[PDB]
Amino acid sequence: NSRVKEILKENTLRSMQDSLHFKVKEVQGVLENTYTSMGIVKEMLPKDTKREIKIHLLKNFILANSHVAGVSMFFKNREDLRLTLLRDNDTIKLMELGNNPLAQKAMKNKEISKSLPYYRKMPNGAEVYGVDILLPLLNENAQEVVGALMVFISIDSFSNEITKNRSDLFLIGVKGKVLLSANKSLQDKPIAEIYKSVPKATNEVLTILENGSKATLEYLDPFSHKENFLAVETFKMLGKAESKDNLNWMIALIIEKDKVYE
Amino acid sequence: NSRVKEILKENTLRSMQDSLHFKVKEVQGVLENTYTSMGIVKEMLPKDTKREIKIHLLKNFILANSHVAGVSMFFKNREDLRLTLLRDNDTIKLMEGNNPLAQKAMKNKEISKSLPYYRKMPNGAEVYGVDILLPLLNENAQEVVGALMVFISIDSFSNEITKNRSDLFLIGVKGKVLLSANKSLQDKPIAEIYKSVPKATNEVLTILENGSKATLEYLDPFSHKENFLAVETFKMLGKAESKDNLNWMIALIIEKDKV
Ligand SMILES: [Ca+2]
Ligand SMILES: [Cl-]
Ligand SMILES: [Zn+2]
Ligand SMILES: [Zn+2]
Ligand SMILES: [Zn+2]
Ligand SMILES: [Zn+2]
Ligand SMILES: [Zn+2]
Ligand SMILES: [Zn+2]
Ligand SMILES: [Zn+2]
Ligand SMILES: [Zn+2]
Ligand SMILES: [Zn+2]
């Protein structure tokens, strides 16, 4: 009889990976839209335009990128072009930069680069878990680095794709850090600690993350005490960019085996 | 053997259906993100910028959207902005307007698409694809000043549909085979290819017209094997309100043996 459960397993794993594969392309496609939008800002910001047009550009960049929660502009030789725009249910512009190590890193890397996830205190006093995306600004003939573009992407804003009306997905960053899960208390914590009761399963997932592969496996969930089918799939979180910092993110999809078997 | 078979049949067909659903959602997601990117190019092109800026933005547009093989812009009052950018192992800039669909798109302020066709590329290769033409408007958004052409490579979607498998088919308007592992079938309608099964092909074409989805079974006259057939349609121009936003379809065959 159990060969029936075995076919049910075969069929469930197939659709998990197809389902998971879509979720990855969806999230990565969203990140790609933002990077594409950033490259346009990058191109226009340093052109011979007046301040208000540059502000006009940063505001519209936030408006059209719902997952962007902030953007900063820095210019070496123009004081009035050192601004930070943070999402405050609208946009709040704060004048300022220069000593910011993110602006300095942006100007020393030709390719799009990143920081690591972190909590930013927002104008309304709330904490937003996110990550910074960096680009350099170049003058007309591309000869000189003249400024920096710094984009704060909200990881919490991906709740729409990961946790809205479902609880079977995790977003995992480098070193196996949980970036977003339905279990809010897991954010910013490593899976080696969360799931230390299944070190063989976690060590495979972490290996799959480091190598940029994909896989399916089983594990006993320590929270539900039920065995889950688990599908993982990594993806380059900076997109098509060839960059030192274009590392692997991972999305996990779980299905408790009991629901399949009947 | 009774309840077991029923459990296996409908669980395998559900897995087949869900898999096709997520492939359809992958494809139209790739298209819509390309359309979002195109809308950005659309709005920036009329803005006050130098020729070199417009060119590099179109060049960046092609490189960011891997399914676009070509893009062209035409300005009514800027002859130096009548250009075509095509993939050529890299990107090649050519100079050119008289396209009746560009006139249609401009005069009516509506998006319009061409029929699928074969474009001869710079390197001599022939690429099956579709043209999507958009009007360009001035800053005040009241007068049409030009047109933007985007040549989407249908063949480039083999990475999602045809690579490493032969169980998927992309079907266009009136059952035209747009993409298939069997390349000889491209640009040919299913009504002729599978004339021997009018019941299934007529179902397919009705599903295509109604924008519906369904699973059915048919005897494939090529493989001589009983197969299931899951189909699902989708608007190929995304959410654009336009009488040219016809339904495309992805079809998935699974040999009835597996069930
Ligand atoms: Ca599939
Ligand atoms: Cl068509
Ligand atoms: Zn404005
Ligand atoms: Zn503008
Ligand atoms: Zn989103
Ligand atoms: Zn067990
Ligand atoms: Zn039944
Ligand atoms: Zn569907
Ligand atoms: Zn693709
Ligand atoms: Zn894919
Ligand atoms: Zn067989």
Side-chain angles (χ1 to χ4, degrees), chain A residues 1-92 94-95 97-109 111-140 142-199 201-225 227-258 260-262, chain B residues 1-4 6-8 10-46 48-49 51 53-106 108-119 121-173 175-191 193-224 226-257:
Chain A
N1 153 83
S2 67
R3 203 145 196 171
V4 151
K5 298 173 176 180
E6 176 182 73
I7 294 134
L8 262 49
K9 178 180 185 175
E10 170 197 317
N11 288 341
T12 295
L13 296 173
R14 173 199 312 152
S15 54
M16 283 186 70
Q17 291 189 117
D18 296 332
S19 175
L20 171 59
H21 174 63
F22 157 77
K23 182 56 57 174
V24 170
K25 288 270 295 231
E26 186 194 30
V27 165
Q28 188 183 44
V30 166
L31 291 160
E32 273 266 68
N33 288 330
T34 302
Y35 307 145
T36 294
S37 180
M38 280 180 58
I40 292 161
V41 167
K42 161 188 171 58
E43 187 72 28
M44 295 309 309
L45 227 48
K47 299 298 178 284
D48 193 13
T49 60
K50 208 212 73 192
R51 187 166 168 277
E52 282 298 321
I53 295 285
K54 303 184 199 300
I55 289 163
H56 168 80
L57 203 54
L58 302 184
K59 289 178 182 165
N60 289 2
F61 166 76
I62 299 181
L63 179 76
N65 292 278
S66 59
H67 292 272
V68 171
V71 62
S72 297
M73 146 180 69
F74 171 83
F75 276 87
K76 286 177 170 170
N77 318 117
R78 269 208 91 194
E79 233 203 64
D80 53 353
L81 299 188
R82 290 159 190 177
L83 308 172
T84 299
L85 293 66
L86 295 174
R87 199 181 282 278
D88 188 18
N89 305 30
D90 65 319
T91 304
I92 162 173
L94 284 118
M95 299 168 180
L97 296 173
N99 306 342
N100 207 290
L102 294 179
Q104 298 181 338
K105 169 168 170 171
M107 295 184 283
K108 289 249 175 53
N109 295 279
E111 295 290 344
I112 188 173
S113 62
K114 74 180 291 247
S115 68
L116 286 172
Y118 75 99
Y119 293 93
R120 171 183 281 264
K121 305 154 234 304
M122 297 295 288
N124 68 333
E127 304 264 70
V128 173
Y129 197 62
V131 72
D132 284 309
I133 310 299
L134 312 172
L135 286 172
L137 302 172
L138 294 129
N139 238 6
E140 315 313 311
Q143 64 289 87
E144 280 212 293
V145 177
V146 299
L149 175 69
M150 302 145 289
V151 172
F152 178 60
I153 292 181
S154 162
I155 291 173
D156 292 334
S157 67
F158 283 92
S159 60
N160 178 40
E161 290 87 3
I162 303 300
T163 58
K164 170 156 174 159
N165 294 330
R166 67 193 300 177
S167 301
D168 53 336
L169 294 169
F170 311 82
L171 180 60
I172 292 162
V174 314
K175 292 187 175 63
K177 184 183 297 305
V178 164
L179 310 181
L180 193 65
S181 63
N183 186 345
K184 224 289 183 176
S185 74
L186 303 188
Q187 185 174 73
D188 193 44
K189 302 180 178 178
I191 55 171
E193 268 157 47
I194 303 166
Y195 305 100
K196 63 194 187 176
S197 68
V198 287
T202 301
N203 287 329
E204 155 157 76
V205 174
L206 291 173
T207 311
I208 290 288
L209 178 63
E210 178 174 45
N211 291 336
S213 177
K214 47 159 172 173
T216 62
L217 54 155
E218 304 182 358
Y219 77 100
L220 171 72
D221 195 76
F223 299 100
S224 67
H225 314 278
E227 289 186 22
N228 291 335
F229 291 130
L230 171 55
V232 294
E233 177 169 350
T234 69
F235 66 94
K236 303 303 185 182
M237 56 73 52
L238 290 187
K240 306 186 199 313
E242 170 179 85
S243 174
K244 170 188 71 178
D245 285 356
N246 190 2
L247 298 176
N248 294 319
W249 277 9
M250 168 182 284
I251 296 178
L253 176 59
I254 60 172
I255 299 186
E256 125 177 343
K257 300 209 298 184
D258 284 352
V260 180
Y261 294 153
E262 270 117 299
Chain B
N1 187 85
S2 181
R3 175 153 158 87
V4 172
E6 171 65 4
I7 276 168
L8 290 191
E10 222 125 339
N11 170 272
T12 297
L13 270 162
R14 231 164 62 253
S15 188
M16 148 181 219
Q17 288 168 171
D18 290 347
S19 157
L20 174 65
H21 170 68
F22 285 118
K23 179 59 66 183
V24 158
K25 258 156 71 183
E26 181 181 7
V27 171
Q28 67 179 327
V30 163
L31 283 167
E32 182 56 60
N33 288 336
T34 292
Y35 298 150
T36 298
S37 202
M38 288 163 50
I40 305 324
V41 182
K42 182 205 190 298
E43 294 292 310
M44 296 297 178
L45 276 170
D48 170 56
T49 58
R51 184 188 203 261
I53 291 172
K54 309 194 199 299
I55 291 195
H56 191 229
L57 297 185
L58 285 171
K59 194 170 274 167
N60 288 345
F61 163 78
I62 291 193
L63 296 173
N65 297 269
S66 50
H67 293 270
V68 171
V71 70
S72 306
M73 66 172 178
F74 160 85
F75 280 72
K76 291 184 173 191
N77 304 312
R78 293 285 306 275
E79 192 158 343
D80 59 333
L81 304 177
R82 306 188 177 166
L83 290 156
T84 293
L85 288 67
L86 284 167
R87 289 196 198 273
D88 181 348
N89 316 322
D90 68 324
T91 301
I92 175 179
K93 177 225 69 174
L94 295 78
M95 196 204 160
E96 284 291 324
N98 323 44
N99 191 332
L101 288 177
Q103 299 294 336
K104 187 126 289 168
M106 285 188 297
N108 289 335
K109 284 173 192 185
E110 301 173 342
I111 170 168
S112 59
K113 71 162 211 311
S114 72
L115 299 168
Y117 71 102
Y118 292 93
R119 170 175 286 269
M121 299 294 292
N123 67 8
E126 294 224 330
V127 170
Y128 192 69
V130 156
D131 284 341
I132 297 170
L133 301 85
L134 303 174
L136 298 173
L137 293 100
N138 49 20
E139 263 121 85
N140 51 291
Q142 293 171 301
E143 230 62 20
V144 170
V145 301
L148 169 66
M149 183 217 71
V150 179
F151 173 65
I152 297 190
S153 174
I154 286 170
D155 286 332
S156 72
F157 285 90
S158 61
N159 286 270
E160 290 85 357
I161 293 159
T162 278
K163 100 183 296 188
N164 308 338
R165 63 195 306 180
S166 66
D167 59 338
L168 290 174
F169 302 88
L170 177 67
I171 298 169
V173 176
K176 181 183 279 300
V177 173
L178 304 182
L179 195 50
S180 175
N182 178 2
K183 303 270 250 295
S184 66
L185 307 169
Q186 183 177 72
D187 200 21
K188 299 167 176 167
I190 57 175
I193 301 172
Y194 305 106
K195 66 181 98 73
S196 70
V197 287
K199 193 194 177 310
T201 62
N202 284 319
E203 264 204 69
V204 168
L205 295 163
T206 302
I207 296 173
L208 190 66
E209 272 195 329
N210 291 346
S212 181
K213 63 189 177 186
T215 56
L216 63 114
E217 45 180 351
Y218 77 103
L219 180 83
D220 192 309
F222 291 178
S223 63
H224 299 284
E226 289 189 354
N227 304 310
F228 285 111
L229 178 63
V231 294
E232 177 172 341
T233 60
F234 65 90
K235 292 291 168 181
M236 71 79 40
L237 290 187
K239 303 144 182 181
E241 176 55 49
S242 166
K243 268 150 166 181
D244 275 4
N245 189 342
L246 277 55
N247 290 278
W248 282 3
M249 173 188 279
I250 299 179
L252 170 60
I253 55 177
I254 190 70
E255 189 164 305
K256 197 180 277 191
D257 288 327

